[model samples]
Target: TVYTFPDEFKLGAATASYQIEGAWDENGKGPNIWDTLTHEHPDYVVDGATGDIADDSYHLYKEDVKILKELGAQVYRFSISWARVLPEGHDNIVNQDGIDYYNNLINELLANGIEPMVTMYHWDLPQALQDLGGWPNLVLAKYSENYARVLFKNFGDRVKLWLTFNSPLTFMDGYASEIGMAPSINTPGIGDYLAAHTVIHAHARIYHLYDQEFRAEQGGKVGISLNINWCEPATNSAEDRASCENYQQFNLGLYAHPIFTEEGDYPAVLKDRVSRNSADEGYTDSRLPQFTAEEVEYIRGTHDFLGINFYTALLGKSGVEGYEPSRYRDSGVILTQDAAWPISASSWLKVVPWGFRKELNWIKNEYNNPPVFITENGFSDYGGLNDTGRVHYYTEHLKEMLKAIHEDGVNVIGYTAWSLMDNFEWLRGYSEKFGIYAVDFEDPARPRIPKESAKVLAEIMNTRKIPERFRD
Candidate 1:
């Protein structure tokens, strides 16, 4: 069956500066955590690789634009590196060279008929900011405010969409709860909550700054990007359903409930459970942060839309027995997957197209159907140009997304493939390829070879209908 998306819907491709734009220290760009960590702790990455020269998009953005043009992408989603624009990461020290680089990219994108959706931050925190206590400190918000001030001042004239933060939970949890990412401190409950608490306020501050200062002139929308693997009740039992709800409120609602809901602040269930658990663990205060009435009002109504990244789903059930009081246990849910499900090159990702519809419906039902843009959705292929698995994964997910929109009436405004081209995969490095256009990392030129999935997306973008190959 062939399906056409709404006329206004935007089909886009995405990339991050650190992942694709190399020349790490070039043009007076300051060092970021990724540069420091990938260099200092070489063993942190799977292949001991770094983004120091990943794809060299700093010198090759023109080539990138050509590829997007070929794919018929109407929008290009990308981020600004804090260190690049402000070498000190704050303090009004603007790097003219960094400014010129992004100005060029934005102008080129516009010249090529691509609207730029700019993400203010994408995990490449400046080393200077990290030394100042990073997300655990409220000072981080002040720095972010200035950083966003620079971006809005410089590019707001042309950029229509602004994403304040991307996947705050992922980076926050990685740093504090898990040793999977940079600044790997394993203080599970305490550090995790503090990090998230700081980010929530930081995001609100930036959104409000843009609203009160720039919106009238720039007339752009501001929002935050959240990533989650949707959860389903493992069974129809009340316990399983309750667990699933807890997982959602804890993961998605923690970020959305405060900003999107009429009654702002954290979810009641999160506060109540975490408070009780704190008492049980002999703490005077709840592990979750409390917001004052004034702060609640300030946080509320900050987002103009929701940017979501959905890749897989989990069968959620009750938390495991004998598990210590940690972030996962606090949710009172256990996330497990079906052994029969097909897996991607990345162990965490699985083929779960129906979950896409379920997640869309969940957001619609829970958050009153706020405007959504799928900021990231794609599958991994280890490394290859002939990517049939990726094509199938995208087709299945799009079918579900269409059902959510046309059948259930979800308000999805746009969709961006996870990446425009493969470069860096963070801890996995370049081994986990999620790009529709496969990049040859070994090649100094890093030539982009279009995969089968690229043809699928190009066809859809050109005709606004499911590709003929996908019509079964």
Candidate 2:
């Protein structure tokens, strides 16, 4: 069967500031948590690699825009480094060099007819903010608002697509788990919950800021990007089915509920379970933070749309697992991927196109069919220019998304491929490559060469349909 995207549905690619920008501390840009992590603990990342010179896009952004134009992409989703703009994570000292860099990139994209979608914060929190206790501190919510105001004031006129935060689920781990991403604080259940609370509040504050201050003048939309993986029941048993539901509520619903649903709060399942577990664990209060009635109202209806970054799926069953008092323990869901499923370079990622369709349908039903934007979706592999595995990944995923759009009536509005070029991959570092355009890290020039997947994505964007050979 052949599949075509809706006429107005957009196609493009995405990259993050730390992942591709490099120039970790250049041109008056202050250090961020990522820079601190790679520098202070070089052993944390594979081969002691760092984003200090990942793709060198900081100096080669024009070439990045040229590749997007050649791909026939309608949009380019890139993040702004928080430290770059506000040297100390505050608005008092605005960095002109940082502002100039983004302006150059945005202007270059516009000149080539590619719309720019700017993510205000993409996990590159300034070191100063981290020093003040990072996302776990409620104060950062206000700080985030101040930063958003700067973004709107400077670039809102040109960037109509604004994502206030990217993947709170992914970043919250930095505080919760010891072996997680930057600022790996190892506070377990307590820190994770606190970080998420602040992030949610931060998201709401930025959204309302845009709505009240920037919307009329800028004419832009504001949303948060969440990374959600589909959970399939490991067995048809009622217990396993309920376990998958719990997983969804805990992971996706934790973030989506307050913003998207008519009843604006964390899922009842999460609240009840966490509260019960807190009692059992001898805690005075529940691990999950509570929002006041007024705060709930403030956070409700905060989104113009929901930006989802989907990659793979997992099988879930009824069980109590994970370290004591942790999120996994609270949810009581045991997650595992089927051995039959095709694997990707990332251990957590696997090929499951049908899961993508199921995930979209779940969102449509749960959130009453709000517009959805696939902010990041791609496969990773070891270095290779042919990249046939990556090619298959895109075709299958796109087909599943199209089915969700055409048959199930899921309101998916746009898609951006995971990356424009290979760069730093956090803990994995340069080991796993997710870019359609391969970047030679060893080369001082940092040249980007299009992989086979790039050619296919270009065809899809150009024709607005899956190529005949890629169709089932």
Candidate 3:
């Protein structure tokens, strides 16, 4: 079985600012929520580590691009730190040094023939914005648009691909769960819904801004990156099947429905359940926010592509047991992984290659086969250069993705590996290694060494096909 990719299909790798670019406070860069969280509560991270000087890509981007050239990567998906450019989280005080830093990095990538795919926000919100109630504050939606305008004005010439937000579902948890990521506000159901409400509007606003203001001149595309795992029914029962569907609607559809579907609004299942739960719990309004008829029209058809960040699968069953009024309770789905599935360094991640194809087809059927870009996909492990497990993970997943493209006719246009180099893994710190290139965190120079997986990916990218040995 020889799996060959389409001629235009792209292969590359990804990284985020807070995860890679060290120099946390260097060159007039202001503090973000990650900075405050790690600095104030270092113990919150698994190894009491912070990304204070993780990969130092801010200063060594040239070396990073050289590695990308070596891998024959076509695209590099990296995020911009909002506070780095707009220190106060506003466009008024633009940081020239920060702008210069990204300019240098983008210039280097273009010089090496690697296209840059920029993510406008990736969970590193400036602390100043969080001080003003962060994503829950409706005003921040307009502020995000201002931030996008700054990005387009500066870097849009070189960057043709833009993702407005990465995993609003994941970041919304920052407000819902105390143990979640930066600005870990624990307002449970209320804060999470409010944050998501604003994020959707922000994404739509930025898309419209680009469509109206920059599209003709810059000719760039704007989309959002969403992360979700395939939810398999625990049994063939109607209840379990419905629960799996509910999980998808609550998680992925929360963002995708408004942007990609015809009758743009929250999923009927989601609205009905949350509304019923709110009434039963003595709330006047549903915990899930509602969009006006005009707002829904504004949000509908807001995307040029759908960026998916998928890793594994879960078994979902009908169950209701969580904090009252919480997302988990509102959806009434309980998820678990099969013990037979191979686990990764990250406890939450398990290897399930077949899930990749299922998830992609799920998107195609749900969203009318929108052009898809796999924004992030990779395996995690403890640090090692001889990373055979990671190599196996990539080959198997790519095979499934290829099957989705060729066999199922799903429109997957590109794939960027989860990371270009090992960096900070948020709450897990540097303990979970997801990079094909292993970075020496102990060394101040932060030298990147390619692993077995890197060589395999390079071969696939260069040949445009899976090696015969890796095929079934």
Candidate 4:
């Protein structure tokens, strides 16, 4: 059962600025959500630490590129801290020094023959923007357009693949309602909806901006990175099946259905459920926002490609009790992990290789098989050099991905490991490690040492082959 990837399939690794590129206040950089939240709400984080200087990647990007080269990854997907480049998160005061930092990093990646895929927003909103109500505030849309334009004008030529935002659901839900992440606001339904509505508009507008203004000259692509977990039916029943499908539509399809599908609006199941829930709660209007006819047309067909960041899968149970309005309760599904599954360092992630294949097929069937990128997928572990468990995680997942490509014919163009090196994991802080290269955070230099899993990834990227260990 040896598996081989197509010659054109790209292999890569990913990292976000707030997670790795520390130097929060250095060189004219303004504060971001991570900076303010970690510092102010120390109790929210496990280590009572901040990403003020996570990996010092701002000054040590050369070492990162060297690691990428050594791993044989053809692509490097990194994010821009919105505040790092544009301090004010608007055009009022452009940060020249901040712009120079990314320019140098992009140039360094190109010099090493690794293609650079840039995510414009990775949840590190400028503190100034957050003060203006951030995503939920309508004012941020205009600011987002201007912010995106600056990046296109500055780095569009070298950066061919650009993502408008990373995991809109995570940011919208966490910042507005989930409260499990930064800026812990507890606005169950209303706030999350407004934030998502604004972000969708922003992403579509920026996609159009690139398509209309930069495409001919830059020859680049623009899209969004969505992180959604797969869900399997709890049992072989109609209720279980419906629960699984609804959860997928709610999590992954919310963003995808609007842009990728022919209808170009919210999924019918999602709209109907939210509407029903609203009526039950004695509201005349639904908590989910509605798009105007023209807005639907504008947002539809905006994506050049789909970037999916999947980690694990859950078993779905139908009809969860809804004491309050929330995303999961709105969907009427309960997610649980099977006891047979192995858990990761992070409580949320459970090992389920087969779920990857199901997720790929679901996206292909739902979105008409658009070209997709595995933007972020990796195994987390307690800090260690050997990390055999991490190696097993990658191998098993890679096997499932290969099956999706070969058997199901999913149009997966690229694959990216969750991180290049260990750094500040949000909320969990430095406790959760998801790096192929382990970083000694206690050391002032923050040196990166390659784990055994790093070699496994390197060999796969170099040969485009899944070995006996990974195969069925």
TM-score of each: 0.98, 0.99, 0.99, 0.98
Compared with the true structure, what per-residue lDDT tens digits does model 4 show for residues 1-472? Answer: 3289888999999999999988899888999888888988888888897898899899899999999999998999999988888888788888888789889999999999999999999989998988888888878878898999999999997899999999998888665543367667888777888888888899888988887878999998898999888899999999999999999888888898999999999899999999998999999899999999999999999998999998999999888755478877888888889989998999989999888889999999999999999999998998898988898988888888888998888999999999899989899999999999999888889898899999999999887898766666
Which of 3 and 4 is the better model by lDDT? 3
Tens digits of lDDT, candidate 2, 68-91: 988899999999999999999988
lDDT of 3 by residue, 1-472 (tens): 3299999998999999999999999999999999999999887898888989999999999999999999999999999999999999987899999999999999999988999999999999999999999998899999999999999999999999999999999999999867668888898889988999999999999999999889999997888999999999999999999999999999999999989999999999989999999999999888888999999999999999999999999999988778886998888899899999999998889999999999999999999999999999999999888998899999999999999999999999999999899999999999999999999888999999999999999999999999999989
Q: List CA RMSD, all candidates.
A: 1.3, 0.8, 0.9, 1.2
Off by over 4 Å in 2: none
lDDT of each: 0.88, 0.93, 0.94, 0.89
Q: What is the lDDT of residue 51 in candidate 4?
A: 92
TM-score, cand. 3 vs. native = 0.99
Once superposed on the true structure, which residue ranges of model 1 sit more than 4 Å away at CA?
A: 321-323
**lDDT of candidate 1 at residue 399, scale 0 to 100:** 84
Could you give candidate 1's per-residue lDDT for residues 352-447 as a string of tens digits? 999999999999998899999999999997877778899899999998998899999899999999889987999999889989898888889988
Compute the lDDT for candidate 4: 0.89
Q: Write down the lDDT that model 2 would get.
A: 0.93
Candidate 1 backbone overlaps, count: 0
